[PDB]
Amino acid sequence: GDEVRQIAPGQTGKIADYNYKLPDDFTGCVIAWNSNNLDSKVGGNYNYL
Amino acid sequence: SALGKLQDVVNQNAQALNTLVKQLSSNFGAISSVLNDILSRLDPPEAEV
Amino acid sequence: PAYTNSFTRGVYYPDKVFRSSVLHSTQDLFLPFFS
Amino acid sequence: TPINLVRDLPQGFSALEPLVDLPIGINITRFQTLLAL
Amino acid sequence: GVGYQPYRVVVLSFELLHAPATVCGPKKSTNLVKNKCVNFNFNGLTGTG
Amino acid sequence: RKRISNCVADYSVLYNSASFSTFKCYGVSPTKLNDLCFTNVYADSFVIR
Ligand SMILES: *[C@@H]1O[C@H](CO)[C@@H](O)[C@H](O)[C@H]1NC(C)=O
């Protein structure tokens, strides 16, 4: 969810700090789409460390 | 007052320098006029603006 | 209400900062001269 | 100040050192004073 | 909903004033050097001189 | 409106903790909080949805 919007040029966040930092010159595009039918397993999927 | 012309040149130059230095204390719309304060308070993404 | 003139009274330091041999204006809440 | 007067405030300069910055966190609209009685 | 649930908010108001610094962070104090160019950081006036 | 007297304000554990939905800051940055030396801090608290 919101972590999808947490990645962007010049953004501070837990994703930015340690997981996935985008540079502040990002000449690209971020394509995000809900994936409840692809990788969302019932009871919570423990593959998202 | 005989040497008004010579003194005027000195006064004009000193006055111009003083205004130049006084301009260093202006904000220009920034949060602070001290460059160190901006650097020590904000991350690069928000310090550049 | 009796009245009087305050000649050169109620002058304080608007800023806690020190400085020497400077004639600088300060926009601050002061007591008017001769008020 | 170390004044020595006859009557009324004198003529002359005198600064005012900052004594304390009281953290009140209130508003103020009307004030009074206190005296020795 | 997420937009209508109890959201506790505490807003911390600061001020970058030359007034004496009373609230500061956990940084160890070093020794006083003099007669030498150094990066001096006493309370907030970080700088070189 | 509770303010803070003289102390050593350790802001370090305020964003490095998964207990805050939003940590938006203006005029200051989370990682830079620990290095600041404020004259005072106001802790104003209210609740919104
Ligand atoms: C201060 O707050 C009180 C409480 O309502 C109010 O009556 C008064 O008018 C306020 N004064 C100012 C100057 O806002």
Side-chain angles (χ1 to χ4, degrees), chain A, chain B, chain C, chain D, chain E residues 1-27 29-49, chain F:
Chain A
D2 299 274
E3 295 198 341
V4 181
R5 201 215 53 72
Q6 190 161 37
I7 58 173
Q11 183 163 9
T12 190
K14 59 159 290 310
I15 288 311
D17 286 328
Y18 298 116
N19 280 307
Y20 204 80
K21 194 72 221 73
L22 296 188
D24 306 335
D25 67 351
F26 181 56
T27 315
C29 185
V30 161
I31 308 306
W33 55 285
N34 170 87
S35 46
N36 304 340
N37 57 323
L38 275 295
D39 201 274
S40 199
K41 276 74 70 178
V42 299
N45 166 36
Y46 291 167
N47 193 15
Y48 298 154
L49 61 83
Chain B
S1 68
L3 303 97
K5 300 181 190 288
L6 300 191
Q7 190 67 41
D8 282 11
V9 170
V10 171
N11 288 352
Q12 268 182 308
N13 294 335
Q15 180 177 45
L17 269 178
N18 281 350
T19 68
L20 187 66
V21 178
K22 289 296 304 318
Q23 284 302 95
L24 280 171
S25 64
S26 295
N27 293 109
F28 298 110
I31 63 182
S32 175
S33 77
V34 189
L35 197 63
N36 283 317
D37 283 24
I38 307 178
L39 296 166
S40 72
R41 275 171 59 193
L42 273 64
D43 287 322
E46 304 82 23
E48 297 197 351
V49 299
Chain C
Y3 282 16
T4 308
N5 288 4
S6 64
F7 307 148
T8 49
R9 295 288 172 189
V11 173
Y12 60 74
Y13 307 79
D15 58 58
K16 206 167 283 180
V17 176
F18 169 94
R19 48 181 88 87
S20 170
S21 300
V22 180
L23 281 62
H24 65 279
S25 294
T26 79
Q27 200 288 333
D28 201 326
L29 298 170
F30 285 111
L31 176 78
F33 277 19
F34 298 87
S35 87
Chain D
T1 79
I3 58 163
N4 46 5
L5 274 45
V6 59
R7 183 246 176 279
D8 196 65
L9 268 47
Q11 66 289 18
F13 64 90
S14 287
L16 295 167
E17 298 80 35
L19 183 63
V20 54
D21 178 10
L22 304 178
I24 58 169
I26 69 173
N27 78 2
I28 288 152
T29 316
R30 63 181 293 165
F31 79 97
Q32 65 182 357
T33 199
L34 310 169
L35 275 73
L37 283 66
Chain E
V2 65
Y4 298 108
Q5 270 171 63
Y7 277 33
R8 265 181 176 204
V9 180
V10 68
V11 307
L12 319 183
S13 301
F14 303 159
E15 68 275 16
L16 269 291
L17 292 182
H18 45 68
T22 61
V23 176
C24 314
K27 277 173 63 41
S29 291
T30 56
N31 267 11
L32 195 144
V33 176
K34 56 184 73 174
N35 306 113
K36 188 156 61 58
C37 182
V38 291
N39 297 115
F40 63 91
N41 174 354
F42 282 44
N43 295 347
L45 73 165
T46 81
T48 311
Chain F
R1 180 150 283 201
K2 171 191 288 294
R3 86 203 292 142
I4 316 300
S5 66
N6 301 85
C7 65
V8 298
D10 176 85
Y11 294 80
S12 88
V13 61
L14 295 171
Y15 49 95
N16 307 314
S17 171
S19 65
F20 304 97
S21 82
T22 60
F23 207 86
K24 70 182 182 180
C25 289
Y26 293 141
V28 75
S29 171
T31 188
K32 299 285 187 68
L33 290 170
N34 298 304
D35 313 307
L36 310 195
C37 202
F38 313 84
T39 185
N40 172 55
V41 173
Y42 264 120
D44 300 325
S45 55
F46 43 70
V47 183
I48 54 172
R49 59 197 189 273

